[PDB]
Chain length 125, copies 2
């Protein structure tokens, strides 16, 4: 079961921007959960500004709770073509974030997709 999710900024440089999601998960099975990795996507007005897979395996022991870390990185070159769409929509942007963890109980897997939609406006001029 997912107990909480908290987003924060990660290491941000001039070339890449990181968002860090921290998910507290409780294992409600009698066997351990392995999260072998995750796929992530970030779309902003239909521009796909992030699309990646991270290979970092983590176990959650049976009946235990564990904070999982998801590093979502944005290549700025794809972010520079979002900017066009932002102002084109009257400085309004729809953001869709999807994290698809690879959960292993067994070569046999489960791959749920967690979607989060948001919106932001700017008023710069």
């Amino acid at each position: 079961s997912l107990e909480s999710v908290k987003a924060m900024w990660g290491v941000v440089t001039d070339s890449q921007t990181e968002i860090v999601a921290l998910a507290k998960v409780r294992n409600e099975d009698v066997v351990p959960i392995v999260v072998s990795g995750y796929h992530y996507t970030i779309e902003m007005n239909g521009v796909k500004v992030a699309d990646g897979y991270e290979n970092s395996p983590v176990t959650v022991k049976p009946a235990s709770a564990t904070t999982l870390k998801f590093s979502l990185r944005l290549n700025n070159s794809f972010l520079r073509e979002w900017w066009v769409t932002h102002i084109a929509n009257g400085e309004k942007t729809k953001i869709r974030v999807a994290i698809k963890p690879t959960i292993e109980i067994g070569r046999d897997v489960e791959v749920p997709v967690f979607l989060r939609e948001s919106e932001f406006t700017t008023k710069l001029l």
Copy 2:
């Protein structure tokens, strides 16, 4: 005399962003004003994201009013190092825009600096 200033977005591409300022000026002298060009700067949290000179000479006839156009272009490569500072300040940015027109009445000139300061916050996460 400056009657009004109106800002709007100009041609925005993936490589460069344009802001267009439209200034209505009335000539209150008995001779014509020539605006031979202008220097512009845009600073965002002390990152100088724009710094340019445009050579476009325009006359305002004596006692007449004229809309002047100032094209302020931002190179995105300097904009990508602003982003660091924006989130570093809790997603707050101070913007300083300066337009320095070259006004010719006479080789003899007048070069006033028009400053405009603003602030914006985002709350993305």
